[PDB]
Write a protein that binds this ligand. Structure first.
Ligand SMILES: *C(=O)[C@@H](NC(=O)/C(=N/OC)c1csc(N)n1)[C@@H]1N=C(C(=O)O)C(=C)CS1
Length: 260
């Protein structure tokens, strides 16, 4: 397709490896670029973890208000919200918001711990039909993004299908799906990523990720106006261990999708 040549040229003009999956929920048509290659998910894995806790809350009705202690030993590499509540508590709802809206890695680990370890996150993926997602490590080591490492990876096609079901489908209960939508719409870390490539009149919720090898990720659900919503995954990683972030590549991929 014309879009695929447009993305291949963007990739060639980036020096790295680009993966894209778009779901047009008008006719279930899809645009895929390296859609079945594995990419390090990095902090985009927070969507699966937060959704898995939301699924638990369908049975445990008060689970989101459960306080969780934040201890000095819980702190890791990037802790913007959790560091404000050390020696106190945060609720699972507050931890979910911190993970999904500020990329707080301590919050992600509290979600993982609530699910019984990384295997509890992968389990929820399999329970909703995602046979590709795998979470193997806690934060921050899940973001090492080493070329060829199968750990903590998924494919663009699989993540796009999962994100649809979580945010627009019925993989979650209605109150839970709406809460995840509110959290994603309120993300603060995505202004330079997919959001920067789309028309200003489209509503977006997304969740970014980054890691070594200049790994720069964003997954988003997009509501243009008066038409069927979109689901877009843009993953990008580079050959150099110390490569710089390239959020502009995700913005440019979204623009290219949006054109077609
Ligand atoms: C998720 O992607 C998080 N990334 C990391 O913690 C990384 N460290 O892993 C050892 C990392 C290495 S280089 C880099 N840019 N991140 C958090 N995610 C984001 C995000 O939204 O991209 C952050 C900017 C805070 S770290």
């Amino acid at each position: 397709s014309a879009v695929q040549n447009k993305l291949a040229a963007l990739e060639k003009s980036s020096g790295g490896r680009l993966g894209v999956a778009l779901i047009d929920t008008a006719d279930n048509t899809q645009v895929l670029y390296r859609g079945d290659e594995r990419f390090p998910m990095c902090s985009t894995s927070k969507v699966m973890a937060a959704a898995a806790v939301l699924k638990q809350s369908e049975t445990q009705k008060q689970l989101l208000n459960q306080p969780v202690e934040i201890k000095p030993a819980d702190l890791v590499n990037y802790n913007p919200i959790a560091e404000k509540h050390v020696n106190g508590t945060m609720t699972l709802a507050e931890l979910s918001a911190a993970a999904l809206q500020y990329s707080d890695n301590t919050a992600m680990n509290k979600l993982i711990a609530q699910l019984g370890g990384p295997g509890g996150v992968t389990a929820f993926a399999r329970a909703i039909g995602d046979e590709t997602f795998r979470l193997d490590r806690t934060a921050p080591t899940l973001n090492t993004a080493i070329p060829g490492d199968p750990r903590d990876t998924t494919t663009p096609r699989a993540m796009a299908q999962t994100l649809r079901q979580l945010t627009l489908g019925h993989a979650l209960g209605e109150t839970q799906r709406a809460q995840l939508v509110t959290w994603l719409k309120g993300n603060t870390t995505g202004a330079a990523s997919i959001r920067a490539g789309l028309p200003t009149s489209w509503t977006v919720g997304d969740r970014t990720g980054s890691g070594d090898y200049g790994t720069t990720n964003d997954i988003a659900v997009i509501w243009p106006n008066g038409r069927a919503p979109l689901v877009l995954v843009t993953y990008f990683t580079q050959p150099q261990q110390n490569a710089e972030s390239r959020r502009d590549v995700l913005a440019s991929a979204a623009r290219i999708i949006a054109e077609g």
